[PDB]
């Protein structure tokens, strides 16, 4: 059958739970589309971006070529001027809220309100809603999505495959003087944002900041102008998700699973499986987890100290997380302290299981206990123990075979 007819294997990750994930595989021939631009994409998804989220009709959408979501209704590229509120001016915003004169007071006033409206206009245009029972599949080796992202909100049964996503740029990042000690700029757009949705399969896609690395975005208020956000974020009670054979490269914050320490509504959810993904020269959240039983296996993480993106940490152990990591392979071209690979964000002794981890450093290649490594050099301890046993997987490859396999098969254009 067609590529759009392919569905998630019976035991391939949490997304296989119950009836599994079939996306728009059962779509009628009249509901199989080929799109080449923003308008055609929104039309194939329903005809109206906002209400498209309620379109649960089985549908297959093939993405051919490059689709820039940062375009007007005539599909012509637009710049910040197109979105800019009449009461907003970047320079004026810089002068008004610089930490050196505004301090750490809550950002407010006409300029901020104007920034919010400008941001909303871009958001309403570049974040494409995806309805239930949808399969968005890239054609060939050059299917690309840029300037925007997919919003998988309050829907179920969605498949996204074979597409190269260039992370969307937020033209009106919010300045938060209290984010950290020095404050930080924060953006809203992700290439794929999964919110309150279940049974989602993200497979063989490539995520990159591409032609717009953070390094080229500049600095304001003495802080990097972070116009990017997540590559693939999962939050607000989303559940049963499988992230496989994807490439995540040249990006800062990759994958968030659970966005709040206090959202108890996430408890019992956020069950995600991530396997055979290629993380190359990314900074953090690979992934960062809160509440979920997240299965992480056969992933290849590769970092070079020459990369534009520094490395902070890979596995974020958040509140009530239940990470179960198996046979992941890490490669660094510098003698990094392996205790830095795991980072914990909690007030309690969290539990996680980890086994078969290999670290490949200039001083040697070997199996390593990352949890033990973390504990030896940190304060708050992490307990290595089995609290649950992953059942949704067909095969777990031996760790030394991971690099060759992932490098060869992960990412857009590497199927068939
Ligand atoms: Ca996000």
TrEMBL record:
The entry's keywords: Calcium, Carbohydrate metabolism, Lyase, Metal-binding, Polysaccharide degradation, Secreted, Signal
Keyword Iron listed: no
Protein residues bound to Ca(2+): 190, 229, 233
Subcellular location: Secreted
Gene3D superfamilies named among the record's database cross-references: Single-stranded right-handed beta-helix, Pectin lyase-like
Lineage: Bacteria, Bacillati, Bacillota, Bacilli, Bacillales
Transmembrane segments: none
Organism: Bacillus sp. TS-47
Pfam families: Pectate_lyase_4
Protein family per UniProt: Belongs to the polysaccharide lyase 1 family.
Cellular component GO terms held in the UniProt record: extracellular region
Chief location of this protein within or outside the cell: secreted
InterPro entries linked: Pec_lyase, Pectin_lyas_fold, Pectin_lyase_fold/virulence, PEL
Domain Pectate lyase: 106-336
A single BP term in Gene Ontology: polysaccharide catabolic process
Protein name, entry field: Pectate lyase 47
């Amino acid at each position: 059958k067609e590529l759009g007819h392919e569905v998630l294997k019976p035991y391939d990750g949490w997304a296989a739970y119950g009836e599994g994930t079939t996306g728009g595989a059962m779509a009628s021939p009249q509901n199989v589309f080929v799109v080449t631009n923003r308008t055609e994409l929104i039309q194939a998804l329903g005809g109206n971006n906002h209400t498209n989220q309620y379109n649960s009709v089985p549908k297959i959408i093939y993405v051919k070529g490059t689709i820039d979501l940062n375009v007007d209704d005539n599909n012509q590229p637009v710049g910040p001027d197109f979105y800019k509120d009449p009461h907003f001016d970047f320079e004026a915003y810089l002068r008004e809220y610089d930490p050196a004169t505004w301090g750490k007071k809550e950002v407010e006033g006409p300029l901020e309100e104007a920034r919010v409206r400008s941001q909303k206009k871009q958001k309403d245009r570049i974040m494409v809603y995806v309805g239930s029972n949808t399969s968005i599949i890239g054609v060939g080796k050059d299917a690309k999505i840029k300037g925007g992202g997919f919003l998988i909100k309050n829907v179920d049964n969605v498949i996204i495959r074979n597409i190269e996503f260039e992370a969307p740029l937020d033209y009106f990042p919010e300045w938060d003087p209290t984010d950290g000690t020095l404050g930080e700029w924060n953006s809203e757009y992700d290439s794929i944002s999964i919110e309150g949705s279940s049974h989602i399969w993200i497979d063989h896609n490539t995520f990159t900041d591409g032609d717009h690395p953070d390094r080229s975005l500049g600095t304001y208020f003495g802080r990097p102008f972070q116009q990017h956000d997540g590559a693939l974020d999962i939050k607000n009670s989303s559940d049963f998700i499988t992230i496989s054979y994807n490439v995540f490269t040249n990006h800062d914050k990759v994958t968030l699973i659970g966005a709040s320490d206090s959202r108890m509504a996430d408890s019992g959810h956020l069950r995600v499986t991530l396997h055979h993904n290629y993380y190359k020269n990314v900074t953090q959240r690979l992934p960062r987890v809160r509440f979920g039983q997240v299965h992480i296996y056969n992933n290849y993480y590769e970092f070079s100290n020459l990369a534009d993106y520094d490395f902070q940490y890979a596995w974020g152990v958040g509140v009530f997380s239940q990470i179960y990591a198996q046979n992941n392979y890490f490669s660094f071209d510098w003698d990094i302290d392996p205790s830095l690979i795991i980072k914990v964000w909690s007030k309690n002794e969290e539990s996680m299981y980890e086994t078969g981890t290999i670290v490949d450093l200039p001083n040697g290649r070997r199996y390593i206990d990352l949890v033990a490594s973390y504990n030896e050099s940190n304060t708050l301890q992490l307990k290595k123990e089995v609290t649950w046993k992953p059942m949704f997987y067909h095969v777990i490859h031996p760790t030394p075979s991971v690099p060759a396999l992932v490098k060869a098969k992960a990412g857009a254009g590497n199927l068939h």
